[PDB]
Paper text:
We determined the crystal structure of the complete human [name] core domain, which shows a novel mode of dimerization within the glutathione S-transferase (GST) family. The long [name]-specific insertion forms an extended helix and a flexible loop. Notably, the [name]-specific insertion (α-loop) was present in all constructs, in contrast to a recently reported mouse [name] structure. The results indicate that [name] forms a unique type of homodimer mediated by a hydrophobic surface and a disulfide bridge. The main differences constitute a missing α helix between β2 and β3 and the unique helices α5 and α6 with the connecting α5-α6 loop. Variations in these regions prevent [name] from forming canonical GST dimers and interacting with typical GST substrates. Contrary to predictions, we show that [name] lacks helix α2. On the other hand, the catalytic Tyr9 residue of GSTA1-1 is conserved as Tyr29 in [name], but Tyr29 points in another direction and makes central contacts at the [name] dimer interface. A CMT-related mutation cluster of [name] mainly localizes on helices α3 and α6, and less on helices α7, α8, and their connecting loops. The main cluster contains 27 residues that interact closely with each other in the crystal structure, including salt bridges, hydrogen bonds, and van der Waals interactions, forming a network of interactions.
Residue numbers in the entry:
A (entry chain A): 23 to 72, 77 to 160, 186 to 302
B (entry chain B): 23 to 72, 77 to 162, 201 to 226, 236 to 268, 270 to 302
Write the structure that this text describes.
C-alpha cells in the first residue's frame, strides 16, 4: 500500500488531534515522534511548550487542520469511518460550525499564560518551577507594563473561552434533552463522533493539563461538559492515543 | 548522528532552490523524491506543474523559504559555507532585496501562461500537446511578463557593477533564486524574450552557473523531459 508517514511531536496540541483522527479512521500510519526525552538544556517535554507533516505518496501536507482535511478526503474505503457528514446533510453546518469554533481558540496563548501567571490556574499539572525559570528604574516600570498588558490579554481570552464553552454546554444540553437516559448517549453534534468532537476532547484534555479546567467545569458548573469529558476519557481510541499524554512522569 | 531529511518533488521550483542550497553548503541530506513518473491520470511530470518539508532532529520546517532560513541559521560550523552575510553587515540589506524581489515573481502564473497561450513562448521545452490537452487570459499574461521585464532590468544593472556573482564575491541566496528562476524561464520558453542582442552580462551569468560543479550535479537535467 501507499505508506502513510507522519512526523510530529507527541505532546503538541496539534499532533494530538492528528493522531486521534488517524485512530478514529483506523488508518495505518508510520508515526515518527521527533521529540527527544531530554533537550540540549536537559529539560523534559512539559518545559518546552512553544507544525506536523504528513507524507502520503506524492502528497506532502503540513499543519494539523490541513492534514485532517486531507485524511477525510482521500481515505474513503467503506470500512473507513467518516468524521464529517456529507456536505449536503442537515448536520454538516453544525459540525463545521463547532469544529471552527474550537479550532479558533488560542491554545498556545493559554499554555504560555499558564507557565507565566500561574495564579490564574487551579491544579495546574505543570510543576511550579517551570514558572520560576521562565537608575535602571526605566526597566523596572518597563517590565511592569508588559506584565500588566500580558495579564489584561490573558484574562480577556479566558473570558472568550468561557463563552465558547457556554455554547458547547448549551449544545450538549440539547443532546441530553433529545436522548433517553437509558440508551447510547450522543456526542456533540449527533450520534457520530465527528471532527468537532476530536477538537473538543483534545481541547478539554489540554485545558485540564494547564489547570484551566476547574474554572470552567466541575462542582456544578457546565455539568453536560463535565459528563462529556469523563466520557471521552473512557473512549478506547482516546485512551490508546492520549491516555498518558498529561502524565509528566512519562517521557 | 542527527539525520537531515527532505521530502520534495524533484521538478518543483521551490524544491530546486532547497536542494541547491543543501549542495552549496555541503550538507549530507537524505532526500526523498515523493513524485512519481506517471500519475493516476497517466501524465508525465511536465504536465503537473501546479510544499517541501525538512526534518532535522526535533525540527520540522515546511515552506522552502523557511527551510533555507533554517539551514542558514543552524549549520554554523566554520567548514559550512554561508550563503548570507551577517544580519548587521553592510551587504545584507541589498542581498535580501533581490532575494525577496526574485522570490516574489509569479512563477506559477508564468508556467500556466506557457502551457496556455504558447504564442508568447519561444523555444518552450514543454511539448505542444500540453497546450491541446489543458485547453480541454492573454491580457493578464502580457502584464506579468512586462512586470518581469522591469524586475530583470534591475538585475541587469547590478551585474554591470562587478569573477564575482550577483551581489558580491561569494555565491549567495540571491544567486540560487536568480539561477533557479532563469533556468525555469528557459524551460518555459521565456529565455530568448529576455536575453544574443539583449542583457549581455546576464547571458554570461546564466551560462556561467550552468558550468558550476554543484548546480550541474543537482539541476543538470531538471529541464530534460526525457528523464523522469
Amino acid at each position: 500500500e501507499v505508506k502513510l508517514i507522519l512526523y510530529h511531536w507527541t505532546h503538541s496540541f496539534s499532533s494530538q488531534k492528528v493522531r486521534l483522527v488517524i485512530a478514529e479512521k483506523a488508518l495505518k500510519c508510520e508515526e515518527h515522534d521527533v521529540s527527544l526525552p531530554l533537550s540540549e538544556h536537559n529539560e523534559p517535554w512539559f518545559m518546552r511548550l512553544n507544525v506536523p507533516v504528513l507524507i502520503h505518496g506524492e502528497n506532502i501536507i503540513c499543519e494539523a487542520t490541513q492534514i485532517i482535511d486531507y485524511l477525510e478526503q482521500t481515505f474513503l474505503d467503506e470500512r473507513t469511518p467518516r468524521l464529517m457528514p456529507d456536505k449536503e446533510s442537515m448536520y454538516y453546518p453544525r459540525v463545521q460550525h463547532y469544529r471552527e469554533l474550537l479550532d479558533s481558540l488560542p491554545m498556545d496563548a493559554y499554555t504560555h499564560g499558564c507557565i507565566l501567571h500561574p495564579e490564574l490556574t487551579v491544579d495546574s499539572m505543570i510543576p511550579a518551577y517551570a514558572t520560576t525559570r521562565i537608575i535602571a528604574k526605566q526597566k523596572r516600570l518597563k517590565s511592569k507594563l508588559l506584565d500588566h498588558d500580558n495579564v489584561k490579554y490573558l484574562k480577556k481570552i479566558l473570558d472568550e473561552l468561557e463563552k465558547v464553552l457556554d455554547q458547547v454546554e448549551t449544545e450538549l444540553q440539547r443532546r441530553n434533552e433529545e436522548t433517553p437516559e437509558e440508551g447510547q448517549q450522543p456526542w456533540l453534534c449527533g450520534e457520530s463522533f465527528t471532527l468537532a468532537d476530536v477538537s473538543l476532547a483534545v481541547t478539554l484534555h489540554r485545558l485540564k493539563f494547564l489547570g484551566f479546567a476547574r474554572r470552567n467545569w466541575g462542582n456544578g458548573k457546565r455539568p453536560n461538559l463535565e459528563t462529556y469529558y469523563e466520557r471521552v476519557l473512557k473512549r478506547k481510541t482516546f485512551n490508546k492515543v492520549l491516555g498518558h499524554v498529561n502524565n509528566i512522569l512519562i517521557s
